[PDB]
mmCIF file of N, CA, C and O and ligand atoms in Angstrom:
data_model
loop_
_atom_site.group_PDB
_atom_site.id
_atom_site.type_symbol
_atom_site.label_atom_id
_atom_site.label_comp_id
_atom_site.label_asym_id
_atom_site.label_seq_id
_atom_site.Cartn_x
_atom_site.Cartn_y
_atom_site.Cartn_z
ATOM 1 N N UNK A 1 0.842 -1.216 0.000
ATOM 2 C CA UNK A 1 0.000 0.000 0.000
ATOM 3 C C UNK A 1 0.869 1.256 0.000
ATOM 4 O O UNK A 1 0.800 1.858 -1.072
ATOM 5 N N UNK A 2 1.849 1.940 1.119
ATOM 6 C CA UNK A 2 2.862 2.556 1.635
ATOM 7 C C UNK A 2 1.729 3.846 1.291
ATOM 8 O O UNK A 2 0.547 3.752 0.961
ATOM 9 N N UNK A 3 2.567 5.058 1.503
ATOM 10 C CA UNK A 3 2.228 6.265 1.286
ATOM 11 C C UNK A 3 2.658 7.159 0.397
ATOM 12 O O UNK A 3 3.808 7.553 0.591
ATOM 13 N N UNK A 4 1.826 7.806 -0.942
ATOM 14 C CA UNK A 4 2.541 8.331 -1.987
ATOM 15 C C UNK A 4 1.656 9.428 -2.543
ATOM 16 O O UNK A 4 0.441 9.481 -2.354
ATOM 17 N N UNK A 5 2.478 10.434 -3.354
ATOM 18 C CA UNK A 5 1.199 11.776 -3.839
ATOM 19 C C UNK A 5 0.477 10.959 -4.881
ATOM 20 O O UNK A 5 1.077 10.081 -5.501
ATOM 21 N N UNK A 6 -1.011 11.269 -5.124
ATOM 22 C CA UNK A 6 -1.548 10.832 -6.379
ATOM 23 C C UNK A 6 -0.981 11.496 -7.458
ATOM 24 O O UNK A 6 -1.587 11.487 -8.529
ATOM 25 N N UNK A 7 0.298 12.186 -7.331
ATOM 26 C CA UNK A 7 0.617 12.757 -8.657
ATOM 27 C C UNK A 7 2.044 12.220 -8.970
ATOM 28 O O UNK A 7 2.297 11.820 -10.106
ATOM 29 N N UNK A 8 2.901 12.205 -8.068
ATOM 30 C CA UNK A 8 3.903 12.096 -7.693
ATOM 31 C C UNK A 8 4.613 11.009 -7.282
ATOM 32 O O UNK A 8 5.169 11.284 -6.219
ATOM 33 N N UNK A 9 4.827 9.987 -7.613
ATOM 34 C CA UNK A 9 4.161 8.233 -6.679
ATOM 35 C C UNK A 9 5.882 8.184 -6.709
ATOM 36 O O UNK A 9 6.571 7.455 -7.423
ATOM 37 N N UNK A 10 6.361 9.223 -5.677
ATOM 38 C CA UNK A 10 7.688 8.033 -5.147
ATOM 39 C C UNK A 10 7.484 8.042 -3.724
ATOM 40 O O UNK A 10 7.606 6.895 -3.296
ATOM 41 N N UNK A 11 7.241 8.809 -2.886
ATOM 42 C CA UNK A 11 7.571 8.636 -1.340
ATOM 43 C C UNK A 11 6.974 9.479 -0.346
ATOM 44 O O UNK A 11 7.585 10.506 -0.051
ATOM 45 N N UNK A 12 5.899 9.228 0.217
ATOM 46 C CA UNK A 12 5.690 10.349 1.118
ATOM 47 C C UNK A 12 6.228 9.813 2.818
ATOM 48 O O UNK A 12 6.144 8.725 3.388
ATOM 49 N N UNK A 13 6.676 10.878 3.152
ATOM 50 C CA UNK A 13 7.278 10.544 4.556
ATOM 51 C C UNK A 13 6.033 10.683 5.696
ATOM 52 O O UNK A 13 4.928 11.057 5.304
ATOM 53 N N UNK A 14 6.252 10.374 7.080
ATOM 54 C CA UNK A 14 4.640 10.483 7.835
ATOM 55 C C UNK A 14 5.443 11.447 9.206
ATOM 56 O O UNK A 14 6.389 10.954 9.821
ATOM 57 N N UNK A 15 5.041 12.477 9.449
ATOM 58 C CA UNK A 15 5.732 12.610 10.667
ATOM 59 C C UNK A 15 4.470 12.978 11.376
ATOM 60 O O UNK A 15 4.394 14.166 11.691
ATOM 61 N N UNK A 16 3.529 12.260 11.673
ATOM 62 C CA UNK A 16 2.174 11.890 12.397
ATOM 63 C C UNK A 16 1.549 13.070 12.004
ATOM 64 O O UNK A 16 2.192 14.077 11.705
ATOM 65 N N UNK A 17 -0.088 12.985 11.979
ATOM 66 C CA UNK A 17 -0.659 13.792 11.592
ATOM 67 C C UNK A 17 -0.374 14.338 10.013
ATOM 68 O O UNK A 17 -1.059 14.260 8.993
ATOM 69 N N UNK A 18 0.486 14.717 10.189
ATOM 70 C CA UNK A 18 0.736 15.176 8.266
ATOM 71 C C UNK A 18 1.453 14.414 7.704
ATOM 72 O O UNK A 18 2.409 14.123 8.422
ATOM 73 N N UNK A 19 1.467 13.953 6.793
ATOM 74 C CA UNK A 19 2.776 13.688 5.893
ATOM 75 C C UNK A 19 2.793 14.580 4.742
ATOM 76 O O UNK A 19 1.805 15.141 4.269
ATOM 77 N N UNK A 20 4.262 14.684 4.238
ATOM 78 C CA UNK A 20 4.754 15.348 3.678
ATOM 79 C C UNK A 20 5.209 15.182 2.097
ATOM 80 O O UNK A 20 6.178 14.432 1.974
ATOM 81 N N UNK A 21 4.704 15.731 0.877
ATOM 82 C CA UNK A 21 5.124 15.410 -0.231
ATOM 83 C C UNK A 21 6.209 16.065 -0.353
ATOM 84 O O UNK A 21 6.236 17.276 -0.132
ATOM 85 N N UNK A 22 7.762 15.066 -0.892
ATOM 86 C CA UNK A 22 8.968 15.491 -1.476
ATOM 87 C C UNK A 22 8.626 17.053 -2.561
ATOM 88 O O UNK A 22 8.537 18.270 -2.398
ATOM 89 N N UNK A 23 8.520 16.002 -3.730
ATOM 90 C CA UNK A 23 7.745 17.086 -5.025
ATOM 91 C C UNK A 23 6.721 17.409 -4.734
ATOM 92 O O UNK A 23 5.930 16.578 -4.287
ATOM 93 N N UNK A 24 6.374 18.732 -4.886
ATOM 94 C CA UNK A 24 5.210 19.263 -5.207
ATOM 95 C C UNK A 24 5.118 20.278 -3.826
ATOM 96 O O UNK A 24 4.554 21.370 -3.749
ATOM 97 N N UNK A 25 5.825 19.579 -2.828
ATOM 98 C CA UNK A 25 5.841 20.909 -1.456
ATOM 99 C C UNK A 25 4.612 20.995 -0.751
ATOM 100 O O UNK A 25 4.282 21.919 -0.007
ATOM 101 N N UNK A 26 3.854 19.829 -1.068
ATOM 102 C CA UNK A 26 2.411 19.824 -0.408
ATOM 103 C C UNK A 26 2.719 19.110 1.022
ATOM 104 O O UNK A 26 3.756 18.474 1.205
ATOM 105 N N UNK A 27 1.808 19.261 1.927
ATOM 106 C CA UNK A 27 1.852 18.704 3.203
ATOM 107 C C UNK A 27 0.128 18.040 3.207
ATOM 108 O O UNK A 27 -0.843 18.786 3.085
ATOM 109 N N UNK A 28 0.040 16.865 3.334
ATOM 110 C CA UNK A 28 -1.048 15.804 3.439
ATOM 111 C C UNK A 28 -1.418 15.627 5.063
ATOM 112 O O UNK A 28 -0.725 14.941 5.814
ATOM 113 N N UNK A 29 -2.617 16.351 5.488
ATOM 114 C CA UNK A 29 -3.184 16.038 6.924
ATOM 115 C C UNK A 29 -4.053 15.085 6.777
ATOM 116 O O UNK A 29 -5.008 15.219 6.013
ATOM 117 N N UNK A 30 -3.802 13.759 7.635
ATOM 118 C CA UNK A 30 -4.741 12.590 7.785
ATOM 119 C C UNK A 30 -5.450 12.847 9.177
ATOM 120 O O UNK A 30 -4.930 13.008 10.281
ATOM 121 N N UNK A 31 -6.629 12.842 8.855
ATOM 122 C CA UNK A 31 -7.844 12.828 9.898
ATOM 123 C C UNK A 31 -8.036 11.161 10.667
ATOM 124 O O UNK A 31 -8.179 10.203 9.908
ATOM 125 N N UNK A 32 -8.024 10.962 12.030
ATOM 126 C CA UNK A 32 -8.165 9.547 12.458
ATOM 127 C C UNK A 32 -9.960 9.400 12.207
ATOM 128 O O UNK A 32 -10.461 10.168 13.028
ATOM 129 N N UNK A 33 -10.765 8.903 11.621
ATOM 130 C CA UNK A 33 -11.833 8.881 11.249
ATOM 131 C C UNK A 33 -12.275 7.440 11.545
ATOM 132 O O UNK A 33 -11.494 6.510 11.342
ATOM 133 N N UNK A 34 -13.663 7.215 12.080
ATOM 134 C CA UNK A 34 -14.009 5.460 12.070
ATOM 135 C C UNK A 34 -15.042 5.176 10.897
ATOM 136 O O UNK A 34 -15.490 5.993 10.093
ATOM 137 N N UNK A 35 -15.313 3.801 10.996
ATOM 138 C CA UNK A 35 -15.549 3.147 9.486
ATOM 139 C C UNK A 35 -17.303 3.368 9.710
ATOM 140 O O UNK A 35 -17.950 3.287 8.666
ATOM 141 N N UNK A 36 -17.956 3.590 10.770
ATOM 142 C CA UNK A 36 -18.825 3.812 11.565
ATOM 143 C C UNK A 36 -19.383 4.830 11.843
ATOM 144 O O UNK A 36 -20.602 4.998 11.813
ATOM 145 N N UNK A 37 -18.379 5.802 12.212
ATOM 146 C CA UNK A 37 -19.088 7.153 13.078
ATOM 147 C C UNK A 37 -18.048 8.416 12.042
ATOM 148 O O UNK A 37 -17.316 9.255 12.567
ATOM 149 N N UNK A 38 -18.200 8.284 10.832
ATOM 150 C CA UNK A 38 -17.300 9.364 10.094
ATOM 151 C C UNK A 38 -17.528 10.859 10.302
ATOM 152 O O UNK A 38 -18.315 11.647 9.778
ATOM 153 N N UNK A 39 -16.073 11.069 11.747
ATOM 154 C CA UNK A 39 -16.197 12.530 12.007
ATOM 155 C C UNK A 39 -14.693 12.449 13.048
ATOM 156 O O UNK A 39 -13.989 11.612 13.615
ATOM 157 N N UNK A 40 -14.773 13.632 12.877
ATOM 158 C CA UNK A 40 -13.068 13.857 13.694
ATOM 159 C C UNK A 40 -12.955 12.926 14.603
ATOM 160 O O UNK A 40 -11.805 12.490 14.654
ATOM 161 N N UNK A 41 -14.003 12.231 15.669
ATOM 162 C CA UNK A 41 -14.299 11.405 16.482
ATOM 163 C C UNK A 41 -14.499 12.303 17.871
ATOM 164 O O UNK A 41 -15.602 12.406 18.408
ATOM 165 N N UNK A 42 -13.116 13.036 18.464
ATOM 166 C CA UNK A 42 -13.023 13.352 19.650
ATOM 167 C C UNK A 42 -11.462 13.750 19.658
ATOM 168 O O UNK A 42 -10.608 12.877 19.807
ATOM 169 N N UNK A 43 -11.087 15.268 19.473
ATOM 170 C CA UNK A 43 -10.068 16.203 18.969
ATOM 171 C C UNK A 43 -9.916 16.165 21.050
ATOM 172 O O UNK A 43 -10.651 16.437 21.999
ATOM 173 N N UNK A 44 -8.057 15.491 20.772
ATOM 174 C CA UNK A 44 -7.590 14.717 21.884
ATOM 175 C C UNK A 44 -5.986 15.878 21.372
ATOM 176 O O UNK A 44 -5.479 15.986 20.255
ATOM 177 N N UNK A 45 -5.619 16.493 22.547
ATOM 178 C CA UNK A 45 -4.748 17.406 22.338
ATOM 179 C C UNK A 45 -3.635 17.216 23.390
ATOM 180 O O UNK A 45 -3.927 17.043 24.574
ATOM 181 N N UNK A 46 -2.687 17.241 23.067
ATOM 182 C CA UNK A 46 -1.658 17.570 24.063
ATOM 183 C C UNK A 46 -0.563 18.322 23.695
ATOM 184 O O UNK A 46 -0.066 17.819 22.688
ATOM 185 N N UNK A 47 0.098 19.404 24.098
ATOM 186 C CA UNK A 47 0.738 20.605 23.548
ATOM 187 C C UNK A 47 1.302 20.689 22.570
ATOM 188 O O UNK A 47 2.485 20.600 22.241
ATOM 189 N N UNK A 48 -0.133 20.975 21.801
ATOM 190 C CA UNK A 48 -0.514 21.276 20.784
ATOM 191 C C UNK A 48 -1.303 20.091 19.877
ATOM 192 O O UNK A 48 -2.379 20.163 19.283
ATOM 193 N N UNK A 49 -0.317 18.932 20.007
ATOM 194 C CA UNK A 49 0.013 17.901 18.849
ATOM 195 C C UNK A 49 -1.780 17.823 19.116
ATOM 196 O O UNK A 49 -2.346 18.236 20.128
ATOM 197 N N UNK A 50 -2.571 17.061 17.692
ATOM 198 C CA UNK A 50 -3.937 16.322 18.336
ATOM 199 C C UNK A 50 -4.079 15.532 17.068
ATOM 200 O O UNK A 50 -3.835 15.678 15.871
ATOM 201 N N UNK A 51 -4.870 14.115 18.328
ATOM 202 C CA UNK A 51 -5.324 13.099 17.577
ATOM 203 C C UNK A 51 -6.647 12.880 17.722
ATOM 204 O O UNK A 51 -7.438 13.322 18.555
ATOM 205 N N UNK A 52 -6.811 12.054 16.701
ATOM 206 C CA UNK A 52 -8.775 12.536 16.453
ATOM 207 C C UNK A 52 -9.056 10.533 16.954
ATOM 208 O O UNK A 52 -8.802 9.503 16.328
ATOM 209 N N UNK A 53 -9.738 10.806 18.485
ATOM 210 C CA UNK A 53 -9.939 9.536 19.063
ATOM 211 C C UNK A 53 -11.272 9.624 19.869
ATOM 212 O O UNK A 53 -11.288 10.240 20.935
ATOM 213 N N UNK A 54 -12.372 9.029 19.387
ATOM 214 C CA UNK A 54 -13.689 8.973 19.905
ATOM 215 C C UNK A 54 -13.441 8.014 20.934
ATOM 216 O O UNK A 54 -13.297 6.815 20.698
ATOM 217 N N UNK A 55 -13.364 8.761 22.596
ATOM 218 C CA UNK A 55 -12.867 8.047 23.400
ATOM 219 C C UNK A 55 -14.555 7.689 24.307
ATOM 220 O O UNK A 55 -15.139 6.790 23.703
ATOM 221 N N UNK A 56 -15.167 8.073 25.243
ATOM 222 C CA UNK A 56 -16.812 7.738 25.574
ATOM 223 C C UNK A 56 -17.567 8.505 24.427
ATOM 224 O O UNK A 56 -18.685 8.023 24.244
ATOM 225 N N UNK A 57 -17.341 9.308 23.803
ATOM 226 C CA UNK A 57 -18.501 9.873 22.694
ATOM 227 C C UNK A 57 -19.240 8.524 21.629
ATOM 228 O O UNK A 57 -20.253 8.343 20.954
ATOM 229 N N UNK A 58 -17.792 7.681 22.078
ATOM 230 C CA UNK A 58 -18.530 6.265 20.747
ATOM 231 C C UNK A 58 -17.638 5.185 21.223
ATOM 232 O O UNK A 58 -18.071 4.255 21.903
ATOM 233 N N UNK A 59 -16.208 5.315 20.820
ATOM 234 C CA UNK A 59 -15.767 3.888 21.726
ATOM 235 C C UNK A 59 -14.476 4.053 20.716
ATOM 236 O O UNK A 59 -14.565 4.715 19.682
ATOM 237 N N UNK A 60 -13.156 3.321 21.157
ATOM 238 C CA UNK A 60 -12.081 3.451 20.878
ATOM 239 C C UNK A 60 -11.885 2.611 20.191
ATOM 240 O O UNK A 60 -12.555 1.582 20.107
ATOM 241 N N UNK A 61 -10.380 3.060 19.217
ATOM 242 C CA UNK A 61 -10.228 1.771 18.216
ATOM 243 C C UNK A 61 -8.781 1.716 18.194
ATOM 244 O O UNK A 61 -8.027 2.673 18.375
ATOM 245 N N UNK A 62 -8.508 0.708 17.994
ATOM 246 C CA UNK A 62 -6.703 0.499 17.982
ATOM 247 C C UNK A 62 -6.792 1.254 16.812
ATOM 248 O O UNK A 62 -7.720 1.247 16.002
ATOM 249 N N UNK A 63 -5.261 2.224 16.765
ATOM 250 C CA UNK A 63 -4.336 2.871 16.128
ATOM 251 C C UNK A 63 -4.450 2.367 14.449
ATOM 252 O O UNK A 63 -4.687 3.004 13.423
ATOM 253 N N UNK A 64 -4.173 0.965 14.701
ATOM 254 C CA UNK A 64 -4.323 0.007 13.989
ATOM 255 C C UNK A 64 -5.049 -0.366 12.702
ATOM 256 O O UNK A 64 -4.821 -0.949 11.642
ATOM 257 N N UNK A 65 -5.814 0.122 13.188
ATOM 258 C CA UNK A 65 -7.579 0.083 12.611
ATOM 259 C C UNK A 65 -8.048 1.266 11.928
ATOM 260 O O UNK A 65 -8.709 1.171 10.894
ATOM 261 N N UNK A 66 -7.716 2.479 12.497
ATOM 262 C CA UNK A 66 -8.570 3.706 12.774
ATOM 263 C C UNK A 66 -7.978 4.720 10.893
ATOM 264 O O UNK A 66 -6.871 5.042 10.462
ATOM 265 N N UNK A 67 -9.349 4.871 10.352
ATOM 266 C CA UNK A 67 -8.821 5.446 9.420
ATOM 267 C C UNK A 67 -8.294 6.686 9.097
ATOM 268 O O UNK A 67 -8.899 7.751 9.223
ATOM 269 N N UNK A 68 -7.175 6.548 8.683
ATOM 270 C CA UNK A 68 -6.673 7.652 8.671
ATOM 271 C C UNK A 68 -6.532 8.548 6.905
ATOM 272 O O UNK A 68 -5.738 8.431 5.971
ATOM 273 N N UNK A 69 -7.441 9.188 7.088
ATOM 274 C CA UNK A 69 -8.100 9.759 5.637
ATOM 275 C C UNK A 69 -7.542 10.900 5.371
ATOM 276 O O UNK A 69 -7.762 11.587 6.368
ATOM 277 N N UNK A 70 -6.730 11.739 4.343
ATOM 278 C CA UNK A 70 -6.183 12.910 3.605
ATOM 279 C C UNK A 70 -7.355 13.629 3.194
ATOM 280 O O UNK A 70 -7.930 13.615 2.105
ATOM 281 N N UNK A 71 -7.690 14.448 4.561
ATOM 282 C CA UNK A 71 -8.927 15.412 4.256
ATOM 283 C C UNK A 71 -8.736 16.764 4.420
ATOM 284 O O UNK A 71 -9.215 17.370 5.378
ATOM 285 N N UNK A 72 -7.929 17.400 3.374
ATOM 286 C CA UNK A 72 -7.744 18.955 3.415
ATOM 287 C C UNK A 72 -8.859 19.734 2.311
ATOM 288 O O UNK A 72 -8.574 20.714 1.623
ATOM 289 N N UNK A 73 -9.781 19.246 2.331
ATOM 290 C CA UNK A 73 -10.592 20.079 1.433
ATOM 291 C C UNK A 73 -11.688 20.733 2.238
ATOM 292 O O UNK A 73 -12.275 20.156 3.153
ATOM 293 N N UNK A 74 -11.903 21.833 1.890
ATOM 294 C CA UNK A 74 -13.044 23.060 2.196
ATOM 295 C C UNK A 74 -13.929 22.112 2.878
ATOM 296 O O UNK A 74 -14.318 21.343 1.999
ATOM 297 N N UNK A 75 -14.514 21.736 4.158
ATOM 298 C CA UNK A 75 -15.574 20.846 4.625
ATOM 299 C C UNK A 75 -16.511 21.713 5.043
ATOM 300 O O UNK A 75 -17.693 21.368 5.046
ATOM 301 N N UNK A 76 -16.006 23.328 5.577
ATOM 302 C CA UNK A 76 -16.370 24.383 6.009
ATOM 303 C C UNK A 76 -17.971 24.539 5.216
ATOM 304 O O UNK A 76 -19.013 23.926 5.453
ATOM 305 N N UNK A 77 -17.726 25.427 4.374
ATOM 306 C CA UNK A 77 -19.243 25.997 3.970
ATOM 307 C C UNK A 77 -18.840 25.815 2.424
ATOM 308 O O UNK A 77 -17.908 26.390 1.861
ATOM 309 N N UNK A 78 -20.111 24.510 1.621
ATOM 310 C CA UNK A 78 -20.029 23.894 0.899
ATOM 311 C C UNK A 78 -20.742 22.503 0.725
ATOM 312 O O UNK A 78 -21.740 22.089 0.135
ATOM 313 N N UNK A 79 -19.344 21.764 1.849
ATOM 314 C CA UNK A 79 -20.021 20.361 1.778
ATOM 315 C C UNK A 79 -20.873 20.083 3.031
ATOM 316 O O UNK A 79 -20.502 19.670 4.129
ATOM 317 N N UNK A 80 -22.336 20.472 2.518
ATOM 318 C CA UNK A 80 -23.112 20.402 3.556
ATOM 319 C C UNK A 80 -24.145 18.979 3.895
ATOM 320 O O UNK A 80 -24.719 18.617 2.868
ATOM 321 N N UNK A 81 -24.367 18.413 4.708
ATOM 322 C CA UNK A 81 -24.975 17.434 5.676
ATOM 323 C C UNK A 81 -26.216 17.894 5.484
ATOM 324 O O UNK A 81 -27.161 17.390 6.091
HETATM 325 ZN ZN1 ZN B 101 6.391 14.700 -5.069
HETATM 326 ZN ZN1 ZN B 102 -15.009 5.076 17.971
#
């Protein structure tokens, strides 16, 4: 599978939360999202860093599991529910 730009397919590096495209100078933010309850889950912070973990709001999921989706697009006002 590994991690790569859809444009660019040699290497993206992960330094949690973002990874980083070589070419192109883009930075890729993965959202921890479940297969179930698709939403940030439960924005879990510690100075600064945050991971998106639905801890009593719904129920936890190994690391493992938990999808981690490249969602930098406008969710704001647009894609509306
Ligand atoms: Zn590239
Ligand atoms: Zn959950």
């Amino acid at each position: 599978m590994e991690i790569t730009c859809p444009v660019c397919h040699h290497a993206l590096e992960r330094n949690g939360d973002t990874a980083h495209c070589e070419t192109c100078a883009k930075d890729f933010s993965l959202q921890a999202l479940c297969p179930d309850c698709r939403q940030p889950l439960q924005v879990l912070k510690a100075c600064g860093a945050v991971d998106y973990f639905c801890q009593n709001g719904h129920g936890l999921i190994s690391k493992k599991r938990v999808n981690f989706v490249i969602s930098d697009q406008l969710e704001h006002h647009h894609h509306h529910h």
